Design a protein around this motif. Structure first.
Motif, mmCIF file in Angstrom:
data_model
loop_
_atom_site.group_PDB
_atom_site.id
_atom_site.type_symbol
_atom_site.label_atom_id
_atom_site.label_comp_id
_atom_site.label_asym_id
_atom_site.label_seq_id
_atom_site.Cartn_x
_atom_site.Cartn_y
_atom_site.Cartn_z
ATOM 1 N N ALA A 1 29.589 29.039 -0.287
ATOM 2 C CA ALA A 1 29.282 30.467 -0.253
ATOM 3 C C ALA A 1 30.539 31.244 -0.669
ATOM 4 N N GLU B 1 33.317 38.249 1.879
ATOM 5 C CA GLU B 1 32.002 38.863 2.150
ATOM 6 C C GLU B 1 30.868 37.837 2.040
ATOM 7 N N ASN B 2 30.933 36.962 1.030
ATOM 8 C CA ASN B 2 29.991 35.858 0.935
ATOM 9 C C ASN B 2 30.012 35.039 2.238
ATOM 10 N N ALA C 1 31.498 34.067 -6.351
ATOM 11 C CA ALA C 1 32.189 35.368 -6.254
ATOM 12 C C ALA C 1 32.896 35.656 -7.586
ATOM 13 N N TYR D 1 31.017 36.019 5.343
ATOM 14 C CA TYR D 1 30.373 36.865 6.380
ATOM 15 C C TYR D 1 28.858 36.773 6.394
ATOM 16 N N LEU D 2 28.276 36.941 5.208
ATOM 17 C CA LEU D 2 26.831 36.888 4.999
ATOM 18 C C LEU D 2 26.281 35.490 5.321
ATOM 19 N N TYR D 3 26.999 34.442 4.892
ATOM 20 C CA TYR D 3 26.616 33.069 5.264
ATOM 21 C C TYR D 3 26.629 32.924 6.803
ATOM 22 N N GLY E 1 38.228 39.767 -0.903
ATOM 23 C CA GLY E 1 37.232 40.522 -0.171
ATOM 24 C C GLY E 1 35.796 40.093 -0.447
ATOM 25 N N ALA E 2 35.483 39.891 -1.725
ATOM 26 C CA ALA E 2 34.163 39.450 -2.177
ATOM 27 C C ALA E 2 33.853 38.081 -1.633
ATOM 28 N N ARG F 1 25.297 41.532 9.379
ATOM 29 C CA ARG F 1 26.705 41.349 8.954
ATOM 30 C C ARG F 1 27.581 42.160 9.929
#
Ligand SMILES: Cc1cc2nc3c(=O)[nH]c(=O)nc-3n(C[C@H](O)[C@H](O)[C@H](O)COP(=O)(O)O)c2cc1C
Ligand SMILES: Cc1cc2nc3c(=O)[nH]c(=O)nc-3n(C[C@H](O)[C@H](O)[C@H](O)COP(=O)(O)O)c2cc1C
Ligand SMILES: [Mg+2]
Lengths: 215, 210
Positions: free
Chosen positions: A69, A167-168, A83, A170-172, A163-164, A47
């Motif tokens: 995501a 973040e999903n 999320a 980003y991780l994807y 943000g959450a 990440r």
């Protein structure tokens, strides 16, 4: 070193560029995969933020999974999302600036609905040295759905939810070999105008996504 | 249906030895549930079993939320404005309130008291083995424009709590992020400095059996 912290220069006068392609009213997305992909632990290690991108568009499968995501329905019973959100209200709507148009992602039907037939990529209104990319996500807060929440906590709840969801995404991106960078330096009123948003809709964060540049 | 504020509940005394610094095992795992699987199972849980998380699980959870994923530069698992930590993560355990130090991957005792479920609001979240408390450190945002400090710290905290939610989904743990906080009351209980404020709390544990 502290010079990185100087407030970014505003980008003045930019208008939305003309849409490139066929600016379709609805883009249907394929069903997202459920089993396979890179382990979560692997995605946390990888990440990171990327600021220079290749211009090749994401294939439809990747656009679909990214959007799911970030904002998708993961539980049919009650329309639970990937999320969290305060009181289960959908406080954040995810918009996507593509070269063919600005779209709003509809999670319940997993499709994109045209908001504006124009290219609104990199319309944050500030020079943060993030290059042009195949798409931008905009996380828009809907103040109409926050009126039963204490007023002084709305910016915190909107920003945390956004943000959450970012973040999903980003991780994807890490799982799929894509670059991403969340951006909070937004001229919110200018961007809201370009996006033809309603009075009660406020852009909170954007996120620029694509394949990382070749060098 | 809107959450009501709860009166002055005092913090409970700490149970255990309350060691000053807890060493956590080094984060090394790259295996586990696929991300898409964790996204599919991401949800909030409010009723918990009281069994404590083993040391390895606590270490991983903290690393997911706040850890260093890039040694050179100290890059973190979650993004942060200007690459600078604006959020400090605390862990409320029965043995005491600890601050997670990402650089040394350890817990430093902050207060020898049990501060679990000290939000000041009745949101119907049960007692759990631990809370993570995400604290906005305004001391590290004095050169950031005032008008962005709330958005940036909240977005950073939301991303960190999200990494935690996803880790919990991967490990079969329950979690719920809580934002209805009497911030000043909770900051006092935590012995925080005047320019530090809890903005989100996250209650975590195995989901209740019966
Ligand atoms: C709330 C928030 C707002 C951000 N805003 C911007 C921004 O406006 N422009 C930008 O280039 N990066 C922005 N970032 C990205 C950070 O600069 C980036 O996370 C930081 O450089 C650390 O790099 P990393 O993401 O690889 O860990 C933001 C991050 C957060 C959490
Ligand atoms: C910013 C934010 C603040 C929240 N605060 C609380 C809270 O104070 N108490 C609580 O019980 N749940 C809280 N939640 C959890 C939501 O109620 C929950 O995410 C929502 O009910 C949907 O359930 P889900 O997480 O299973 O998708 C919060 C969520 C967000 C995003
Ligand atoms: Mg300080």
């Amino acid at each position: 070193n502290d010079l990185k912290r100087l407030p970014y220069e505003p980008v003045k006068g930019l208008l939305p560029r003309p849409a490139v392609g066929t600016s379709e009213r609805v883009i249907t997305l394929p069903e997202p995969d459920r089993t396979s992909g890179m382990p979560l632990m692997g995605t946390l290690w990888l990440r990171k933020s990327t600021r220079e991108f290749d211009q090749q568009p994401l294939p439809l499968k990747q656009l679909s999974e990214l959007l799911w995501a970030a904002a998708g329905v993961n539980r049919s019973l009650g329309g639970g999302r990937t999320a969290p959100s305060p009181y289960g209200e959908t406080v954040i709507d995810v918009y996507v600036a593509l070269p063919a148009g600005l779209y709003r992602y509809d999670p319940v039907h997993h499709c994109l609905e045209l908001k504006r037939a124009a290219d609104l990529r990199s319309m944050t209104g500030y020079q943060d040295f993030v290059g042009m990319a195949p798409l931008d996500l905009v996380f828009v807060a809907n103040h109409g759905r926050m009126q039963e929440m204490p007023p002084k906590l709305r910016e915190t709840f909107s920003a945390a939810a956004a943000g959450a969801m970012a973040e999903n995404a980003y991780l994807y991106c890490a799982s799929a070999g894509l670059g991403a960078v969340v951006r909070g330096w937004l001229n919110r009123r200018q961007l809201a105008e370009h996006m033809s948003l309603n009075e009660d809709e406020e852009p909170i964060l954007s996120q620029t996504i694509g394949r990382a540049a070749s060098h």
